[PDB]
Amino acid sequence: RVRSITLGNSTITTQECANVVVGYGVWPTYLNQPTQPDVATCRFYTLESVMWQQSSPGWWWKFPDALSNMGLFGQNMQYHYLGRAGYTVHVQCNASKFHQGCLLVVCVPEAEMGCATLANKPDQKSLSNGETANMFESQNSTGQTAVQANVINAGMGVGVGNLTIFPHQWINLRTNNSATIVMPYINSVPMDNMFRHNNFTLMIIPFAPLSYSTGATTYVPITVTVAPMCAEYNGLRLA
Amino acid sequence: RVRSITLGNSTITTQECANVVVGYGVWPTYLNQPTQPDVATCRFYTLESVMWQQSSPGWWWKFPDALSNMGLFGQNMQYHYLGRAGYTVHVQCNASKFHQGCLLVVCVPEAEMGCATLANKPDQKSLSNGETANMFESQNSTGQTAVQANVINAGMGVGVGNLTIFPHQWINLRTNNSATIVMPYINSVPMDNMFRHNNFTLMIIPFAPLSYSTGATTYVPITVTVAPMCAEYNGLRLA
Amino acid sequence: NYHSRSESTVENFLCRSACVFYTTYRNHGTDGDNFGYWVINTRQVAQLRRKLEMFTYARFDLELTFVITSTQEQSTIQGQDSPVLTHQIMYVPPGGPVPTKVNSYSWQTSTNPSVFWTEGSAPPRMSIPFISIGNAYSMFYDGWAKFDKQGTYGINTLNNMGTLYMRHVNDGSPGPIVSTVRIYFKPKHVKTWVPRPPRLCQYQKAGNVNFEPTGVTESRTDITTMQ
Amino acid sequence: FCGSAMATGKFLLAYSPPGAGAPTTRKEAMLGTHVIWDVGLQSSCVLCIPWISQTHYRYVVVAGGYITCWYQTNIVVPADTQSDCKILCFVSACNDFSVRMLKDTPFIKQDNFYQ
Numbered sequence: 001r002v003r004s005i006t007l008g009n010s011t012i013t014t015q016e017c018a019n020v021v022v023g024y025g026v027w028p029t030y031l032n033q034p035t036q037p038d039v040a041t042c043r044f045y046t047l048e049s050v051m052w053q054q055s056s057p058g059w060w061w062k063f064p065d066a067l068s069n070m071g072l073f074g075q076n077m078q079y080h081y082l083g084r085a086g087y088t089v090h091v092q093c094n095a096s097k098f099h100q101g102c103l104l105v106v107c108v109p110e111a112e113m114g115c116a117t118l119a120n121k122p123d124q125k126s127l128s129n130g131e132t133a134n135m136f137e138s139q140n141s142t143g144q145t146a147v148q149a150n151v152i153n154a155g156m157g158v159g160v161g162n163l164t165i166f167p168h169q170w171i172n173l174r175t176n177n178s179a180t181i182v183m184p185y186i187n188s189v190p191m192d193n194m195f196r197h198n199n200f201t202l203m204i205i206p207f208a209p210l211s212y213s214t215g216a217t218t219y220v221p222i223t224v225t226v227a228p229m230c231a232e233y234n235g236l237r238l239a
Numbered sequence: 240r241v242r243s244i245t246l247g248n249s250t251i252t253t254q255e256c257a258n259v260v261v262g263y264g265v266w267p268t269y270l271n272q273p274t275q276p277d278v279a280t281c282r283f284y285t286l287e288s289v290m291w292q293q294s295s296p297g298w299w300w301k302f303p304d305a306l307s308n309m310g311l312f313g314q315n316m317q318y319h320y321l322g323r324a325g326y327t328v329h330v331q332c333n334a335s336k337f338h339q340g341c342l343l344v345v346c347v348p349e350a351e352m353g354c355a356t357l358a359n360k361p362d363q364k365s366l367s368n369g370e371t372a373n374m375f376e377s378q379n380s381t382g383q384t385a386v387q388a389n390v391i392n393a394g395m396g397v398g399v400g401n402l403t404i405f406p407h408q409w410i411n412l413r414t415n416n417s418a419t420i421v422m423p424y425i426n427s428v429p430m431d432n433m434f435r436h437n438n439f440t441l442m443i444i445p446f447a448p449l450s451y452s453t454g455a456t457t458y459v460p461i462t463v464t465v466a467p468m469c470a471e472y473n474g475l476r477l478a
Numbered sequence: 479n480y481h482s483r484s485e486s487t488v489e490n491f492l493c494r495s496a497c498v499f500y501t502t503y504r505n506h507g508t509d510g511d512n513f514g515y516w517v518i519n520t521r522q523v524a525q526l527r528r529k530l531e532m533f534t535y536a537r538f539d540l541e542l543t544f545v546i547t548s549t550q551e552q553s554t555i556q557g558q559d560s561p562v563l564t565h566q567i568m569y570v571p572p573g574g575p576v577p578t579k580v581n582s583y584s585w586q587t588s589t590n591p592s593v594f595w596t597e598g599s600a601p602p603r604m605s606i607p608f609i610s611i612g613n614a615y616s617m618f619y620d621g622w623a624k625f626d627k628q629g630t631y632g633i634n635t636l637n638n639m640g641t642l643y644m645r646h647v648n649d650g651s652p653g654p655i656v657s658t659v660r661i662y663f664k665p666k667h668v669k670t671w672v673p674r675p676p677r678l679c680q681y682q683k684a685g686n687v688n689f690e691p692t693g694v695t696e697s698r699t700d701i702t703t704m705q
Numbered sequence: 706f707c708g709s710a711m712a713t714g715k716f717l718l719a720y721s722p723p724g725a726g727a728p729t730t731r732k733e734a735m736l737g738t739h740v741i742w743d744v745g746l747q748s749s750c751v752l753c754i755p756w757i758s759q760t761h762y763r764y765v766v767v768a769g770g771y772i773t774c775w776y777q778t779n780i781v782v783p784a785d786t787q788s789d790c791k792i793l794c795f796v797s798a799c800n801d802f803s804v805r806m807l808k809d810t811p812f813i814k815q816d817n818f819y820q
Contacts, residue, residue, distance in 0.1 A: 009475045033722075033757045081724040082759055189759050236248045238755040239720035239738035241747050248738035252746050263672070285717070285735040288778050301620070310736045333713045333745065337783035348672050349534050349618040351632050353688040360631040360686075363622075370732070379691050384628065389691040392679060396689035401675035416713075416745070425672060427535045427614040427636065436621030455784020462715060462777055464741070 007227055010044035012090065020180040023107075023167050028086025028184040028230040035084070035191070036235040041073035044090075045226050050133050050204075051219040052093070052101070054212075057136035057151045058205030060111075062198035063087055063226060065128035073228050083194040084185050085231035089202055091179040092223040093171055099220055100211035103171035103204055105179040106163050109186045111201040113155040116146040128198060136205065151205060160205060172208075173220075182229075191234075246466055249283035251329065259419040262346075262406050267325025267423040267469040274323070274430070275474040280312035283329075284465050289372050289443075290458040291332070291340070293451075296375035296390045297444030299350075301437035302326055302465060304367035312467050322433040323424050324470035328441055330418040331462040332410055338459055339450035342410035342443055344418040345402050348425045350440040352394040355385040367437060375444065390444060399444060411447075412459075421468075430473075488670050491529065492536075495543065495664040498523050505646050505655040510579035513645040514659055518606070520617075521684040526663070527677075534672035535614040538665035540606035540639065545662065548597060551654035560651030567602060567659070568592040568643040572609060580645055594647065605666070612636040614671065618687070632687065706748045708780065708790030713745035715777035718752055723768035731775045741777060753799065762805050 003014045030037065045067055050059050068074050077083060091105045115122045123145040128134065136151045147155055154160045169179035187199055202224065210220055242253045269276065284306055289298050307313050316322060330344045354361045362384040367373065375390045386394055393399045408418035426438055441463065449459055484490065499522070501514035518540065521527045530536060546565050550558065568584075569591040570576055575584040584590065595602040608615075615637050623630035644659045679689035706712075719734035721727055728734040742750040754770065780790055 009478065011478060033755045081722060081757070191759055193759070234722065234757060236722050236738055238753055239248065239250060239718060239740055243740075249735075250738075250740035252741050252743045254746060283735075283741075285739075285741065285777070287731060288715075331715065331741075331743070331778075333715055333743070333778040333781050335711050335713055335781050335783050337711070338781065349616065349620045351618045351620045351687050353686065357682045357686070357688045357690070359688075360629050362628050363625075366631075387689065387691060391694055392689060392691050395675075396677055396679040396687055397675035398678045398694050400694060401678075404673055404675055425534075427612045427616040429613070431621075435625035436619075438620070440620070451784050453784055454782075454786065456779060456781040457784070458779065459781060460715065460778025462741075 008040065008043040010046075012044050012046075012225055014090070014180075015178065018178055018180055019169070020182060021167055021169050022182045023184045024186075026184040027182065030230050030232055031084070031190055033235040033237060035232045037230075037232040038073070038076055041076060041085075041228050041231045043072065043227065045070045045073075045228075047131050047133075047224045047226065049221040049223045052103075052206065052210050052222050053219050054210050055138075056206060056210065057138055058203055059133035059135055059222075060155070060201050060203045061133055061224065062111075062128035062201045063089075064194045064198050065130055067226060067228065068130055068195070070131065073231060076231070076233060077194045080233035081193065082191045082234040083231070084191045084233070086182070086184045086229040088227040088229055089179075089181045089183065090225045090227070091169070091171070091181075091202075091204060092225070093173065093177045093220060094223070095173045095177060095220045096216060097174075098213040098216045099173050100208065101173050101206055101220070102208035103179075103206050103222075104163060104168060105171060105181065106166050106168035106203045106205070107181050107183050107200050108154075108156070108163070108166050108203055109200040111156055111198075111203075114148045114157055116141045116143040116148050120145055122147045154203060154205070163203065163205070185230075247279065247282040249285075251283050251285075251464055253329070253419075254417065257417055257419055258408070258415075259421060260406055260408050261421045262423045263425075265423040266421065269469050269471055270323070270429055272474040272476060274471045276469075276471040277312070277315055280315060280324075280467050280470045282311065282466065284309045284312075284467075286370050286372075286463045286465065288460040288462045291342075291445065291449050291461050292458050293449050294377075295445060295449065296377055297442055298372035298374055298461075299394070299440050299442045300372055300463065301350075301367035301440045302328075303433045303437050304369055306465060306467065307369055307434070309370065312470060315470070315472060316433045319472035320432065321430045321473040322470070323430045323472070325421070325423045325468040327466040327468055328418075328420045328422065329464045329466070330408070330410070330420075330441075330443060331464070332412065332416045332459060333462070334412045334416060334459045335455060336413075337452040337455045338412050339447065340412050340445055340459070341447035342418075342445050342461075343402060343407060344410060344420065345405050345407035345442045345444070346420050346422050346439050347393075347395070347402070347405050347442055348439040350395055350437075350442075353387045353396055355380045355382040355387050359384055361386045393442060393444070402442065402444070424469075488533075489668055492538070492665050492668045492670070495541075495662050496523065496526055498526065498661055498663040500658055500660040501644070502656050502658050503644060503646070505649045505657075506652075507580070510581060512580040513577070513643060515644070516642045516661060518639040518642060519684060524681055527681065531617045532674055532676055533670035534618055534674055535616055536665075536668060536670045537608055537614040538668040539608060541603070541664040541666050542606065542642070543601050543603045543662040543664070544595070544644070545601050545660040546595065546597065546644075546657055547660075548655050548657040550651075551656060555651070555653035558651040558653045560653070560655070561648070563597045563650050563655065563657070564647040565595050565597070565602075565657065566592055566645055566647050567595065567604070569604060569606065570641045570643060572638045572640050574640070576641060577643055585643075585645070606639065609639060610636050614669075618674070633685070706744050706790065707793055708744065709782060709786070712780055712782045712790060713743075714780040715744065716742040716750075717773075717775035717777050718742050718750055719773050719775065720752065720754060721771040721773070722757055723770050727771040727773055731777070734773055734775050744780065756801070762803075
């Protein structure tokens with residue numbers, strides 16, 4: 001049936017029979033200066049939808065940078081020196097029964113991406129545009145400081161078909177339309193500066209191209225909604 | 240002895256033998272859309288000190304406007320439509336044993352002040368400068384939209400000697416140096432728009448003029464530190 | 479033992495019937511201005527205004543008694559022989575329709591309370607409950623109705639208690655008749671909060687707290703004098 | 706405080722967490738972590754600086770925070786004195802203090818053996 005989920009002043013709609021992929025089998029928790037929690041940040045931040053077309057390569061978001069300007073939790077990234085949060089990423093897909101296509105929705109921890117120019121580093125804008133998705137290309141990328149965003153190598157110098165090693169979900173339009181991934185906090189330190197470290201990125205790569213019957217809508221909206229979980233920060237006490 | 244009080248990341252120093260005047264015998268509480276509390280606002284907001292001189296009339300602050308730009312609780316006044324808070328006003332006074340003078344520290348609920356021009360209303364700037372104190376005058380005030388801030392009438396058309404009917408404290412420098420007044424939320428409605436309604440004002444009127452021995456410091460600093468208590472707001476839920 | 483403080487109480491102090499307004503309305507006129515009206519206010523009579531403004535918030539019922547007396551005027555009309563005169567005192571609750579003419583549609587008073595009184599009987603009486611979306615009337619308001627407008631300082635719509643309207647139901651005679659209403663006001667079930675100093679400076683405007691600064695008391699010749 | 710016993714006054718002993726930046730006014734110091742050190746009430750003020758870092762240990766060499774003191778009120782005395790007062794500062798470690806990797810101090814230096 002229909003499941004209604006409310007966090008804070010945000011409500012989303014989910015199917016009862018929705019499969020949830022929980023990271024590496026780990027549910028986000030706190031680290032049980034005393035760290036300060038912020039439950040007000042536990043909201044649904046629905047990003048702008050991306051139009052999935054017949055010739056559309058994948059997208060990616062880097063979420064510390066993606067939610068950097070999303071009201072609360074963005075003010076908290078700007079405010080607190082140290083921060084920690086797990087995320088519930090819910091990727092919806094609005095399509096009819098006459099639409100085709102398969103999607104790989106994968107969250108990649110520490111997706112250090114290469115540059116189009118070998119003797120160069122990608123700049124901040126190319127790696128993450130924030131709430132705006134960065135798109136892959138079907139061919140090699142050219143640029144002095146641009147990310148090598150060819151789809152086959154997923155920007156990481158690996159095989160895109162091997163991306164399933166990370167917490168992923170398959171959206172087959174004839175079978176599924178949604179993907180819920182619950183990513184815990186993954187890092188080599190208990191807590192890190194959020195403004196300069198993307199702990200993971202979300203890649204939505206269409207492995208089977210979108211197709212549709214004549215007269216059906218050409219594009220299929222893909223909606224990403226992110227709910228930070230167990231977010232806690234530095235804490236300012238004693239003088 | 241010495242009592243140390245810590246609220247949030249602020250610490251002040253108080254004497255053990257410090258008399259506290261609790262409003263009208265009422266300790267601030269909550270009203271037990273569901274109202275939302277904010278304990279982060281329960282901090283000590285130390286205003287800029289005012290120099291008490293030999294020829295200095297009184298000052299006043301209107302506290303919804305005074306704490307309007309004091310970081311938190313100021314952001315909350317700007318953010319929430321409805322708000323409620325009690326206040327702990329602590330007025331300190333730094334003087335030696337060679338200094339003279341007596342002060343009336345009184346918090347006046349609903350101190351609707353008159354204008355210098357009878358057929359006129361005082362403007363927002365004259366009534367409250369915010370964190371900056373507004374000073375009385377020893378003579379009549381002149382101005383099209385200025386508050387009639389003569390000391391004798393306390394700006395309210397009453398006798399300044401009768402101001403003790405309100406929750407007050409006497410600071411006799413030979414006896415006291417501090418005044419703690421705990422003012423609850425006083426209004427005719429359970430909760431009101433804080434940006435357009437000063438629930439009470441603090442008047443610090445020197446009834447006996449400051450005096451000092453030769454070589455002693457001419458001015459005596461008067462410090463006002465305000466701690467909002469049981470602050471709660473509108474609440475944004477359901478859609 | 480202790481002496482009784484009964485008549486010093488706020489109920490006995492404030493629940494005293496006083497005249498707060500009187501107006502005269504004609505039986506014939508050129509326009510329809512043959513009616514008397516009074517926006518119910520507590521800030522027009524200095525004694526009552528001072529007594530109420532000794533507190534910050536009050537909550538009371540309005541008991542109103544109307545003392546209506548009619549007088550025949552001048553001359554030039556003979557055989558007057560007027561029948562008995564009937565008066566209508568219409569109360570308009572806050573937000574209700576307000577007449578502009580003696581024969582307005584508002585006088586048909588679908589929901590405005592109205593009392594019809596024939597002369598010669600006991601004076602008409604009506605009681606207005608505590609009417610405010612707020613929890614108490616506020617004699618003082620340190621705030622703005624709209625923060626943008628400077629002239630809205632001290633005004634809040636929570637103290638509006640309605641308007642009283644008076645007129646002649648019948649003219650009686652073709653000659654001039656003028657009637658005075660003489661409203662008598664009496665708070666009932668008074669609860670008051672946050673006492674305030676008595677008003678020292680004389681009042682200037684009903685809708686203002688503005689004042690010419692006045693001395694705290696009367697002067698004497700010397701600090702040691704006795705007379 | 707090393708001033709006179711009759712001297713009175715207040716100070717803002719404000720602490721800035723690392724990365725925040727030193728406050729520039731009295732108001733910014735007050736809006737953060739601070740204490741009102743009243744000279745008349747007590748002549749000493751002990752301020753315990755907390756441990757705020759992303760790792761268990763940090764390097765001794767070159768954020769850490771800031772201590773700033775502000776004139777809340779002027780120093781008030783029986784109005785006859787000439788010279789100014791002084792404040793002495795002390796530093797100490799708390800019971801949770803530790804050091805990991807021993808090395809050579811950068812302070813003593815020798816060209817060769819002293820004999």
